[PDB]
Amino acid sequence: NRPNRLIVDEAINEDNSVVSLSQPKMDELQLFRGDTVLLKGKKRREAVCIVLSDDTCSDEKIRMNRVVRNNLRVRLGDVISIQPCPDVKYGKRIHVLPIDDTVEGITGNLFEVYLKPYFLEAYRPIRKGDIFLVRGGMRAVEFKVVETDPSPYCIVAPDTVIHCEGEPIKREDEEESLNEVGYDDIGGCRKQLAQIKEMVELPLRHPALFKAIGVKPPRGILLYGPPGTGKTLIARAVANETGAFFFLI
Amino acid sequence: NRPNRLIVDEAINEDNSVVSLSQPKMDELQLFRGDTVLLKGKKRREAVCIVLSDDTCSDEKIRMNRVVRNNLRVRLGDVISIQPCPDVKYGKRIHVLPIDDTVEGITGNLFEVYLKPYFLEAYRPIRKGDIFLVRGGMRAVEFKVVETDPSPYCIVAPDTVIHCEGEPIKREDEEESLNEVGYDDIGGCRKQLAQIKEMVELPLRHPALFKAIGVKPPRGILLYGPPGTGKTLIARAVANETGAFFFLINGPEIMSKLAGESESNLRKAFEEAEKNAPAIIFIDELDAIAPKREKTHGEVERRIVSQLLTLMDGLKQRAHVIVMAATNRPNSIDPALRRFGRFDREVDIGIPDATGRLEILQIHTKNMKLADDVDLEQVANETHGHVGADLAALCSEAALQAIRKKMDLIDLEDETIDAEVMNSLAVTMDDFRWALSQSNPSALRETVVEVPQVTWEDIGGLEDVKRELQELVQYPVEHPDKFLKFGMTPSKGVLFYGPPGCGKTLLAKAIANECQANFISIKGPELLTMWFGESEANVREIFDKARQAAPCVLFFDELDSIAKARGGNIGNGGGAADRVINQILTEMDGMSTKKNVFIIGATNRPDIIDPAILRPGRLDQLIYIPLPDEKSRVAILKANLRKSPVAKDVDLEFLAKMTNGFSGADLTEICQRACKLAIRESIESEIVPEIRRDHFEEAMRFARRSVSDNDIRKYEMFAQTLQQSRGF
Ligand SMILES: Nc1ncnc2c1ncn2[C@@H]1O[C@H](COP(=O)(O)OP(=O)(O)OP(O)(O)=S)[C@@H](O)[C@H]1O
Numbered sequence: 001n002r003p004n005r006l007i008v009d010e011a012i013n014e015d016n017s018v019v020s021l022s023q024p025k026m027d028e029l030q031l032f033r034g035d036t037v038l039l040k041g042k043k044r045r046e047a048v049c050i051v052l053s054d055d056t057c058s059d060e061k062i063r064m065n066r067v068v069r070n071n072l073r074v075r076l077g078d079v080i081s082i083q084p085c086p087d088v089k090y091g092k093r094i095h096v097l098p099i100d101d102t103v104e105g106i107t108g109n110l111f112e113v114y115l116k117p118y119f120l121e122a123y124r125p126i127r128k129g130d131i132f133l134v135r136g137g138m139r140a141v142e143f144k145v146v147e148t149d150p151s152p153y154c155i156v157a158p159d160t161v162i163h164c165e166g167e168p169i170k171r172e173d174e175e176e177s178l179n180e181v182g183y184d185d186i187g188g189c190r191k192q193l194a195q196i197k198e199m200v201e202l203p204l205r206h207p208a209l210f211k212a213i214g215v216k217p218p219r220g221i222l223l224y225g226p227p228g229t230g231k232t233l234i235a236r237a238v239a240n241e242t243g244a245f246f247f248l249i
Numbered sequence: 250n251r252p253n254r255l256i257v258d259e260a261i262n263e264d265n266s267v268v269s270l271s272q273p274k275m276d277e278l279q280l281f282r283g284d285t286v287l288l289k290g291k292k293r294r295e296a297v298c299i300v301l302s303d304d305t306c307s308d309e310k311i312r313m314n315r316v317v318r319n320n321l322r323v324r325l326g327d328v329i330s331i332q333p334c335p336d337v338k339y340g341k342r343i344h345v346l347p348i349d350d351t352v353e354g355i356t357g358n359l360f361e362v363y364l365k366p367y368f369l370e371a372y373r374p375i376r377k378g379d380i381f382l383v384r385g386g387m388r389a390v391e392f393k394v395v396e397t398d399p400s401p402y403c404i405v406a407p408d409t410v411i412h413c414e415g416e417p418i419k420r421e422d423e424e425e426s427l428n429e430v431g432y433d434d435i436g437g438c439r440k441q442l443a444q445i446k447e448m449v450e451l452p453l454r455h456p457a458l459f460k461a462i463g464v465k466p467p468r469g470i471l472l473y474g475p476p477g478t479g480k481t482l483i484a485r486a487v488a489n490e491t492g493a494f495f496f497l498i499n500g501p502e503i504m505s506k507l508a509g510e511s512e513s514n515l516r517k518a519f520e521e522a523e524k525n526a527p528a529i530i531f532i533d534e535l536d537a538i539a540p541k542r543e544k545t546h547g548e549v550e551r552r553i554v555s556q557l558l559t560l561m562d563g564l565k566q567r568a569h570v571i572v573m574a575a576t577n578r579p580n581s582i583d584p585a586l587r588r589f590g591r592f593d594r595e596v597d598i599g600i601p602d603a604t605g606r607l608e609i610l611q612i613h614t615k616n617m618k619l620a621d622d623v624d625l626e627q628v629a630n631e632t633h634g635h636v637g638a639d640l641a642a643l644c645s646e647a648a649l650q651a652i653r654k655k656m657d658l659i660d661l662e663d664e665t666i667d668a669e670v671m672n673s674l675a676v677t678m679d680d681f682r683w684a685l686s687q688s689n690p691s692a693l694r695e696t697v698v699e700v701p702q703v704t705w706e707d708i709g710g711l712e713d714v715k716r717e718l719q720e721l722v723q724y725p726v727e728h729p730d731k732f733l734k735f736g737m738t739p740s741k742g743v744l745f746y747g748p749p750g751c752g753k754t755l756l757a758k759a760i761a762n763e764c765q766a767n768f769i770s771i772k773g774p775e776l777l778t779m780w781f782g783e784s785e786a787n788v789r790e791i792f793d794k795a796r797q798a799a800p801c802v803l804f805f806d807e808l809d810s811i812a813k814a815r816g817g818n819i820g821n822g823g824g825a826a827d828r829v830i831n832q833i834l835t836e837m838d839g840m841s842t843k844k845n846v847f848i849i850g851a852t853n854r855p856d857i858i859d860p861a862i863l864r865p866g867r868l869d870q871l872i873y874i875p876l877p878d879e880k881s882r883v884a885i886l887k888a889n890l891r892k893s894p895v896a897k898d899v900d901l902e903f904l905a906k907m908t909n910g911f912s913g914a915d916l917t918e919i920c921q922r923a924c925k926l927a928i929r930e931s932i933e934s935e936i937v938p939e940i941r942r943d944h945f946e947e948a949m950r951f952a953r954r955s956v957s958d959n960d961i962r963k964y965e966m967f968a969q970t971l972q973q974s975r976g977f
Pocket residue numbers: 185186187188189226227228229230231232233234
């Protein structure tokens with residue numbers, strides 16, 4: 001029913017917005033390797049991305065980067081709506097702005113160090129109000145386009161121009177700070193993260209269904225291990241990657 | 250007088266209202282197999298049911314389902330009035346309604362999922378204002394007919410119509426919520442439940458009679474056992490299945506209070522219990538509030554313990570108050586509590602066995618819908634260290650695994666999911682296998698007290714020792730009259746000695762099985778590792794646990810490891826008979842003969858066994874198990890090859906005559922090696938399912954003898970002269 005609902009989990013490509021699909025998926029949606037795709041999420045907001053042809057991932061799962069999960073306000077295990085738009089779209093002027101939470105203490109023309117070796121030879125799309133992060137200078141800055149030609153009608157092309165401002169925009173509470181810890185910030189514990197997810201995500205993401213079904217939830221998870229192994233990191237990541245109120249003791 | 254009063258106890262048919270009677274009962278009331286019967290209870294209310302013809306239940310007892318006990322407001326052990334009405338009665342319109350305590354979170358037409366495969370092909374009667382429960386959708390709903398043709402004049406028939414409402418009726422306080430725990434919610438503890446009933450029901454159900462008769466009631470029941478064994482469940486069930494006011498005291502909750510406020514809580518608890526009729530005080534986690542006063546820090550804790558002792562002592566028979574307590578560390582309880590007048594009755598809620606844990610699995614999966622491949626008996630067999638809590642967790646994890654495969658395949662993203670798809674969700678045997686794969690048994694370290702599964706058929710040969718073991722174990726417990734007639738006291742002990750791998754463990758387990766007696770196996774390394782903590786009380790606890798398990802066989806396996814702690818009788822020159830073995834002798838001497846506990850020792854080092862074991866009265870039946878002879882080898886091979894698809898060309902007696910000094914373990918190794926060669930052949934051929942003559946030839950090619958000729962000679966020497974041993 002409605003073959004357009006896609007299940008979301010963490011991606012494997014450690015880059016900017018490049019979604020990954022499964023073997024039946026690119027055939028069902030007749031999408032090619034280097035295709036420009038449009039992702040539709042909750043709260044009436046959109047994201048435009050590039051598909052990646054993967055086969056040995058699972059039967060039905062899309063892989064979503066944490067950079068663009070916040071652009072769609074969708075969390076792990078959530079359902080996403082997708083729409084292929086195989087039309088080449090070039091932007092003329094993108095009015096782009098940083099955020100004054102990650103740009104403090106850095107001056108000068110940050111574009112020649114961040115946006116130059118991040119745009120060229122990539123051909124990635126940009127939508128209105130997209131928070132994309134570029135790493136460089138031994139630090140990471142998330143970045144915000146605020147004004148451009150009508151959305152999205154933009155992919156990275158050499159005819160797209162850039163302009164320095166130096167006036168970062170304040171971050172509102174509608175979006176989650178990407179600087180916070182996520183599942184991508186833990187390495188070496190994937191089996192343990194898998195167990196934690198299996199125990200935690202279903203009771204929290206689907207509380208009404210779980211309560212109606214009348215089965216015992218695991219409510220006593222106890223993380224243990226040698227000091228400095230990421231226990232606090234794992235707990236805070238699970239707190240952040242779910243829409244659960246987190247009280248720390 | 251008045252041959253119409255019927256005594257009520259819990260039923261055996263795990264279904265809706267189907268009453269069960271005894272052999273004199275269907276003849277006395279001239280009622281047939283499939284008869285419609287009308288049950289009359291207290292408070293002027295009625296129930297209509299179907300009789301079940303049973304004979305091997307008891308002399309006079311009716312069996313009542315908990316679904317219809319609440320319809321009659323009658324509890325366990327109560328007297329019921331019955332009236333056969335063998336008239337076929339068909340209802341036209343039954344106005345039926347759910348209750349808004351068990352239907353929350355479920356929408357849609359619940360009749361097509363609940364009442365459809367519950368009515369048809371059953372032909373069960375329905376009365377006015379009957380609360381019947383239907384299980385389905387991984388949950389249970391009790392249900393209420395509120396309007397229909399005159400009562401009852403209704404049985405389940407195809408001409409009875411149904412109608413959806415979606416307006417559940419509120420539950421009044423006149424009836425008890427069936428969702429609460431009852432005796433049907435405990436599995437694996439029937440003997441303990443029987444003892445608890447015998448101790449509790451008479452003082453509570455008949456307080457005036459008990460007070461007038463002037464006899465001491467058991468007022469100090471103390472439940473104990475490993476964590477998660479149902480102690481709290483049992484206490485709450487006994488509270489619910491009797492009309493007793495139930496006041497609960499939580500150990501941590503009491504101890505979390507400020508100084509001087511927890512004492513007030515205990516005093517108020519006892520005062521309320523004394524005030525409110527016959528009552529039960531349940532102190533859950535008693536070790537939290539009452540540890541040993543010698544080992545405790547604060548004086549507030551000591552005041553708490555003293556206050557509890559004072560309240561226990563000030564509890565009079567006139568109060569009609571029964572105090573139950575649960576603790577998973579009974580030895581950490583202050584000894585003053587476990588004395589007479591405070592806590593004198595002790596019930597051990599032990600780890601469930603295979604049958605008991607199968608019953609627990611059924612109790613926890615009755616709401617769940619299982620696929621046809623689900624073998625709960627197999628799951629019970631594959632779970633060993635699990636307790637009731639472990640099994641409940643396993644069932645919950647299997648259900649959640651089933652959901653995980655259905656929440657993605659079917660978009661259950663709806664806020665309040667209906668039951669029209671919940672039934673489509675079924676739990677497969679693969680889900681249970683996955684749940685069992687990821688499960689940590691809590692009671693793995695606990696000692697096992699159960700009837701072992703191995704029979705005589707698993708033992709080849711050894712017919713003479715089988716007969717001797719029968720005479721030593723079965724006869725005293727089966728025919729005490731002969732023993733008292735001839736005046737001989739049965740020997741309480743047997744020592745098995747002989748070459749290794751000849752079936753000493755199997756013999757003890759099999760003689761346990763034939764008597765249907767409990768079996769406790771204590772291996773030598775287990776003793777040597779419990780004793781390294783210098784815990785002299787654990788070996789005493791072993792004999793204690795054997796005492797409540799009577800008739801039981803206490804088997805000490807691998808006594809050679811014990812006797813090799815310091816080398817043996819000489820060893821380093823000092824005696825290896827130390828540590829546990831002296832306490833074992835003391836415990837053997839300190840157990841009464843009239844107890845049905847039988848002690849069996851096994852060792853393959855008769856040279857270094859200390860003589861004090863062999864003294865008459867401790868282990869004086871010296872049974873020597875030799876290497877199997879040619880025919881016993883055939884029997885052993887046949888026993889070991891029962892579970893394997895052996896080809897017809899395999900000549901078992903040829904193998905028996907080609908193996909001379911081999912023990913039963915050696916023949917088992919030969920069979921295992923041949924089976925492994927067959928497995929290798931199958932694996933290679935995949936890139937036939939019958940173990941063949943060639944496989945056995947190849948296995949025999951590398952077959953090895955685990956007992957030397959010198960060892961055989963020395964064992965034969967000890968087989969003749971081991972009674973001497975002691976003395977020099
Ligand atoms: N598995 C990991 N992956 C990535 N970073 C890690 C990992 N484990 C530790 N770190 C880093 O090391 C820091 C150590 O903090 P934590 O490991 O979260 O503290 P902890 O694990 O609770 O150990 P304690 O508190 O000393 S017992 C983290 O904040 C991370 O920056």
